[PDB]
Amino acid sequence: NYYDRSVSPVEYAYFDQSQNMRAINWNKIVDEKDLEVWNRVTQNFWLPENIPVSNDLPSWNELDDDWQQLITRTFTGLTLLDTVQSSIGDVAQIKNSLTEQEQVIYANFAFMVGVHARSYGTIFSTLCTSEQIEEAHEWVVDNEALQARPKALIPFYTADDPLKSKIAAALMPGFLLYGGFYLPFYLSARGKLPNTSDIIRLILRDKVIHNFYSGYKYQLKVAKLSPEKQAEMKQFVFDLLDKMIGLEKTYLHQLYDGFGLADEAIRFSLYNAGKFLQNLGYESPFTKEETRIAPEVFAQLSARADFFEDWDF
Amino acid sequence: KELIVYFSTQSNNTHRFVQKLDAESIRIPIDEEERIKVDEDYVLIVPTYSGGKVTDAGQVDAHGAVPKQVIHFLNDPDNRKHCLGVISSGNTNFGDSFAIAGPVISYKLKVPLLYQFELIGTKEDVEEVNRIISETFNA
Ligand SMILES: Cc1cc2nc3c(=O)[nH]c(=O)nc-3n(C[C@H](O)[C@H](O)[C@H](O)COP(=O)(O)O)c2cc1C
Numbered sequence: 001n002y003y004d005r006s007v008s009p010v011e012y013a014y015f016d017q018s019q020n021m022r023a024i025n026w027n028k029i030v031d032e033k034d035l036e037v038w039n040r041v042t043q044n045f046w047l048p049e050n051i052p053v054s055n056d057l058p059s060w061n062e063l064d065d066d067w068q069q070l071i072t073r074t075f076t077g078l079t080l081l082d083t084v085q086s087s088i089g090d091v092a093q094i095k096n097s098l099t100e101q102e103q104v105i106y107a108n109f110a111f112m113v114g115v116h117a118r119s120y121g122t123i124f125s126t127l128c129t130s131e132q133i134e135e136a137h138e139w140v141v142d143n144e145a146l147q148a149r150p151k152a153l154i155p156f157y158t159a160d161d162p163l164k165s166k167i168a169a170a171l172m173p174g175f176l177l178y179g180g181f182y183l184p185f186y187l188s189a190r191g192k193l194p195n196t197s198d199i200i201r202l203i204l205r206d207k208v209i210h211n212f213y214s215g216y217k218y219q220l221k222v223a224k225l226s227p228e229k230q231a232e233m234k235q236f237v238f239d240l241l242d243k244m245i246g247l248e249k250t251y252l253h254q255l256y257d258g259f260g261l262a263d264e265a266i267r268f269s270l271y272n273a274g275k276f277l278q279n280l281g282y283e284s285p286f287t288k289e290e291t292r293i294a295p296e297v298f299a300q301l302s303a304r305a306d307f308f309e310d311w312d313f
Numbered sequence: 314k315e316l317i318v319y320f321s322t323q324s325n326n327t328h329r330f331v332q333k334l335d336a337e338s339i340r341i342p343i344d345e346e347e348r349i350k351v352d353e354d355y356v357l358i359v360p361t362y363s364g365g366k367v368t369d370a371g372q373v374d375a376h377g378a379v380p381k382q383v384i385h386f387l388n389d390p391d392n393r394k395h396c397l398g399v400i401s402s403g404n405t406n407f408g409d410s411f412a413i414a415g416p417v418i419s420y421k422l423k424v425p426l427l428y429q430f431e432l433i434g435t436k437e438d439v440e441e442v443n444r445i446i447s448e449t450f451n452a
């Protein structure tokens with residue numbers, strides 16, 4: 001059997017030059033879950049140009065300079081995290097893949113998170129002045145609390161522990177941006193920037209699968225380790241999430257200073273922290289109370305949460 | 314005679330939630346060449362796989378919301394008549410396509426949508442679904 005006496009190129013490149021290389025086999029698939037995820041993320045391809053946000057100009061122009069600045073800062077901060085995940089995080093996953101199709105899926109993820117980053121530019125181009133855009137870039141560069149978050153995750157991507165790299169790859173789309181995603185849903189619940197939140201919904205439709213997929217691959221690898229090493233990895237996940245939750249709270253209290261959104265944004269963050277843990281196969285320790293946000297805001301994320309051919313029969 | 318029929322892909326999120334519930338459970342097979350035959354009343358628990366598709370028109374496209382294996386199960390009228398109600402799962406980050414396998418099955422079967430949850434469920438979800446199944450089999 002050719003497959004068991006050959007390596008994928010990326011295995012050959014980084015880990016084992018002792019064997020010849022096999023072309024990807026899309027005809028004989030090891031894991032059907034790979035085909036399910038590939039078909040969905042590629043069929044869900046989108047570009048921000050096809051969501052015109054010029055219809056947001058009226059509601060945007062009614063916001064004062066402070067709220068406009070908050071939106072530009074929040075979104076430039078999200079742009080940084082997407083830039084980290086597209087240029088480092090998702091491409092770093094390719095060489096640590098369990099299957100051939102996983103290598104291509106993470107190439108899709110790296111591209112689509114680039115599209116996520118690029119979409120904030122499309123919003124700024126329509127709504128923001130050159131001064132608002134450049135001020136937001138300076139603020140992101142000079143914000144230590146903001147910078148601490150990606151600085152904590154990047155080392156796992158460049159180090160040689162593939163499981164810790166995978167956890168970081170899940171935590172980015174599963175948790176770290178939701179504190180910022182609160183803002184567009186807060187605004188669109190008040191009829192403000194409704195088209196901008198359509199871009200956010202298309203981003204979440206990608207990120208939910210990215211988190212799920214990295215979580216699913218994490219579980220297949222840890223399940224093979226000894227119970228002792230499985231326990232060690234669980235402790236590492238909870239210790240890292242604790243640290244990241246700490247850094248996120250510090251950042252959101254500064255970001256939302258004088259707007260009063262920090263409390264709700266942090267509860268939305270912890271809601272997503274709970275879903276990060278579940279998609280790693282760990283129970284959420286957060287109460288429904290602890291992760292609660294206002295109903296009108298949650299309805300902007302999902303109205304289905306509730307007012308705000310083979311079938312033979 | 315409390316019974317759950319459920320479907321779960323290889324990721325086993327719905328499997329793990331159902332294994333936390335009090336009632337006995339039967340799994341609809343992943344393999345499309347296998348079918349099961351159920352002759353007792355059950356609540357149906359299934360995940361959603363529409364993937365947040367939208368039509369040309371602009372509404373939620375529910376195509377593939379219900380896994381093919383669940384359609385094959387429900388296509389057998391002997392299986393279908395024993396469904397007391399449906400609980401659907403997914404992820405709220407799919408927005409207007411969140412857990413929509415439930416509404417689809419509820420409409421097709423004319424049975425109540427009893428509950429919606431995410432992933433492997435929380436303590437609160439287990440407690441609520443335990444109570445709702447009991448009351449479904451009582452009333
Ligand atoms: C390709 C794909 C598409 C999905 N589509 C939806 C969806 O349309 N709505 C939803 O609520 N959840 C959706 N989900 C989330 C799953 O329903 C969720 O991960 C569920 O817990 C999986 O259950 P299982 O592991 O038992 O199959 C999707 C997941 C994947 C991988």
Ligand SMILES: [Ca+2]
Pocket residue numbers: 208209212279403404
């Ligand atoms: Ca999911």
